[PDB]
Each structure stands twice: as C-alpha cells, then as structure tokens.
Amino acid sequence: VGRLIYTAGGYFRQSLSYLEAYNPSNGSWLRLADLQVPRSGLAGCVVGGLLYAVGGRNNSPDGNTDSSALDCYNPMTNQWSPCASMSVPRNRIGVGVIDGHIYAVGGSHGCIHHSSVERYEPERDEWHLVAPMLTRRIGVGVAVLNRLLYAVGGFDGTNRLNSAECYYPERNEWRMITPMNTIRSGAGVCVLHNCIYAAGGYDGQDQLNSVERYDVETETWTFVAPMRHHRSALGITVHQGKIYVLGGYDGHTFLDSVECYDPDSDTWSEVTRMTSGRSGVGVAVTMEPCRKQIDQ
Amino acid sequence: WRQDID
Numbered sequence: 001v002g003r004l005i006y007t008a009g010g011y012f013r014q015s016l017s018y019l020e021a022y023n024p025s026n027g028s029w030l031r032l033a034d035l036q037v038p039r040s041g042l043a044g045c046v047v048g049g050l051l052y053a054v055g056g057r058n059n060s061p062d063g064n065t066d067s068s069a070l071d072c073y074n075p076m077t078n079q080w081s082p083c084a085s086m087s088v089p090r091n092r093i094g095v096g097v098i099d100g101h102i103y104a105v106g107g108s109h110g111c112i113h114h115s116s117v118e119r120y121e122p123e124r125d126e127w128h129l130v131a132p133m134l135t136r137r138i139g140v141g142v143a144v145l146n147r148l149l150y151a152v153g154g155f156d157g158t159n160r161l162n163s164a165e166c167y168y169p170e171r172n173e174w175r176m177i178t179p180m181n182t183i184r185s186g187a188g189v190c191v192l193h194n195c196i197y198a199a200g201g202y203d204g205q206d207q208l209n210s211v212e213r214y215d216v217e218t219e220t221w222t223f224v225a226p227m228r229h230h231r232s233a234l235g236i237t238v239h240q241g242k243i244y245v246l247g248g249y250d251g252h253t254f255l256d257s258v259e260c261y262d263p264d265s266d267t268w269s270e271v272t273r274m275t276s277g278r279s280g281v282g283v284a285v286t287m288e289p290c291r292k293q294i295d296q
Numbered sequence: 297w298r299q300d301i302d
Contacts, residue, residue: 011300040300059302092297141301155297186299202299232299249301280300 002046002286004030007235007246008053008073010278012254015059019073019080020295022258022272023288024239025232029275032290033078039067041233043095043104044282047122050074053282055086055093055107056077057267066091066109066233070102070120070127075289084125087118092280094107094142094189096149101163103130106137113138113157117167131172134165139233141189145197145216150177152198155185160204164214178219181212188236188245192263197224199245199261202232206233207251229257235283244271249279 004021013055015035035053042056051073058065066089071078090107098104102120104127108115113136118129144150149167151174153160162179184201187208191197192257195213198221202208209226231248234255238244243261247254259268275295 011302040302138297207299233301248297251301254301 002049004282004286005237005239005244005246006044006051006286007274008044008051008282009035009039009042009056010247010281011059012276012278014038014061015040016278017056019201020275021289021292024271027272030289031295032106032289032292033080034070036080037067037069038081040280041092042067042280044095044099044284045095045097046096046284046286047100047102049284049286051284052083052102054095054102055090056282057091063120063177075287078260078289078291084127085294086127087129088114088116090114092138092140092186093150096142096144098144098147098149103149105142105149106133106140106154108138111157113155130188131167131174134174134176135161137161139185139292141187141198143189143191145191145194145196150196152189152196153180153184153201160185160202178221180221181223182208183212184208186232187232190236190238190243191241192238192241197243198229199236199243200231200234200248206230207232207237207249225261225268227259227268228270229255229259231255233279235281237283237285241287246283247278247281254278257267
C-alpha cells in the first residue's frame with residue numbers, strides 16, 4: 001500500500017541500476033538512488049513501507065552474474081541497504097508477500113531452472129526454504145490472493161508453460177490449478193479484486209498482447225481486453241483498483257509505454273511513458289520519498 | 297533471455 005509506482009532495474013543493452021517512481025496523481029517521474037548492483041529479471045515488493053528488490057541477473061560486458069541478493073530501499077532516507085541473501089541465485093524470479101513474509105519463487109541459475117521456493121522473515125532478516133513447486137519455472141508470474149501464493153506459467157528449460165500452481169502455507173504444499181488458455185513466459189501477473197491477471201508474455205513464437213484472468217471461485221481463466229502493445233518481460237502492479245503495465249519488449253523495440261487497465265470499463269489506456277525503454281523491471285507501490293530528483 | 301530481448 002502507498003502512493004508511487006516504483007520501477008527498479010531492468011534491461012536495455014545491459015542490465016540497469018535505475019530506481020524511478022511514477023506519481024499517477026500528477027504524472028511526474030522521480031529519479032531515486034540507483035541500485036548498488038545493476039539487475040534485470042528481478043522482482044520488487046513492499047513490506048512495512050520498505051521496497052525490496054529480489055534476485056535477477058546483472059547482464060554486463062564485464063560478466064553476467066545471477067543474483068541471490070535481497071536489497072531494501074527506504075523512501076524515508078532514499079537509501080538502499082543489503083539484506084540477507086537467498087539460498088541461491090534466481091534470475092527471472094517471481095515474488096509474492098503473504099502476511100509480511102516475502103516468498104522467492106523459481107528462477108534460473110546458469111542453465112538450471114529452479115523449482116525451489118524460499119521465504120524471508122524481515123524481523124529476523126532470515127531466509128528459509130519451503131516446499132518446492134511441482135514444476136521447474138523461470139520467467140514465472142507470482143501473485144497472492146487470500147493468503148495463498150500462485151505461480152503462473154514460465155519456462156521449464158524445454159517448454160513455455162500454461163500451467164499454474166497454488167501454495168497453501170499451513171500445509172507447506174503446492175497444488176496444480178486450471179492451466180491458462182495461453183502459454184506464457186515473462187507475463188505480468190498480479191491480483192485485482194478476486195482475480196489473478198496474466199498479461200502479455202511470450203508463447204515461444206510471439207510476444208503477447210492478450211490478457212486473461214483466473215477467478216479463484218470458478219477456477220476458470222477468461223480473456224479480457226488485450227493491451228495496446230504486445231509485450232514480454234513487462235513490469236506490473238495494481239494501484240487504486242487499476243492494473244499498470246510498464247515497459248517490456250515487443251519483439252522489435254524496448255518499450256517505454258505504461259498502460260492502465262480499468263476493470264469497470266474493460267479498457268487499456270496509455271497513461272505515461274518511462275524516461276527510457278526497458279524490459280525485466282521489478283515494480284511495486286509504496287509511500288513517496290523525501291529527497292529525490294524530479295525527471296524533466 | 298528472448299522475452300527480455302536479451
């Protein structure tokens with residue numbers, strides 16, 4: 001919960017250190033403190049008003065390194081601090097938060113595709129491994145609804161997946177759910193009201209503009225209006241009852257486009273542009289900081 | 297990888 005849409009890292013020619021924040025209320029962008037280490041394919045999440053950047057990879061000319069890092073950004077100080085690292089590097093990770101605890105899901109390390117899952121306890125600054133998923137998944141979308149964690153699509157190393165599964169923390173156990181109608185790796189996955197949305201992604205042939213949503217009560221996936229741009233490795237968040245998708249790759253260009261989905265009207269609209277095109281960002285929402293620089 | 301356009 002909060003007021004700005006923060007976008008951390010990403011990729012354009014090489015992995016990026018940018019931390020920028022968009023204010024839907026006035027259309028303004030702020031540049032904040034860079035990440036300590038560039039990273040794309042990371043996830044962002046917020047707990048207790050702090051922004052966490054999780055996993056990813058630094059794709060650079062001086063060497064490509066998969067990240068096990070968990071770093072914390074304090075909007076009150078405009079500073080990043082390192083937290084305890086995960087058990088393993090996880091590029092193209094998915095992350096969700098249940099009851100103040102951060103779940104790191106899947107992702108890759110070199111040629112290995114993780115089924116493993118681990119949980120962060122901020123109060124103790126400690127990671128612990130939980131039950132692994134039923135399927136190895138990288139480029140996996142993750143969202144939380146009703147204190148259950150969902151892992152949606154991805155890539156197992158051989159095929160892009162339409163499959164999805166759901167984790168019950170009290171049983172430390174994953175269960176398959178209805179697969180999506182479309183195979184999607186690198187989709188934006190997020191929750192709006194009673195529904196898990198999976199927007200865009202790559203089906204192994206094309207970047208996608210289609211968007212489908214899972215109703216947890218009916219156990220079905222239904223397509224809604226498609227986005228204006230096909231995009232994979234997009235950033236996604238929810239703010240005041242609307243979905244926002246940020247950047248991505250459309251098979252031609254690294255997008256700067258930010259689109260807003262209104263569920264009331266079932267329409268996607270262009271709302272703003274990032275200061276530069278990029279894919280594989282981590283995105284989350286929290287309170288405004290105090291001493292940034294406004295982007296002209 | 298290719299969804300990032302890497």
